[PDB]
Amino acid sequence: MGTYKLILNGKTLKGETTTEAVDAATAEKVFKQYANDNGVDGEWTYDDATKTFTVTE
């Protein structure tokens, strides 16, 4: 568990969000859905060091 962070690094639109997920899969799914909702879909990365994900459109 813990608080995860998402970094939307899009060519068109960018943003950031944070959510409390039980595991990395739940985190990645919530964020995938969130990014796709913002119309962001690029190379997804992860930084366990600070529990963050970055999607580079």
UniProtKB/Swiss-Prot annotation:
Residue ranges of Sequence repeats: 3-57
Positions of transmembrane segments: none
Cellular compartments annotated: Secreted, Cell wall
Name of the protein this chain belongs to: Immunoglobulin G-binding protein G
Source species of the chain: Streptococcus sp. group G
Gene: spg
Part of the whole protein covered: 303 to 357 of 593
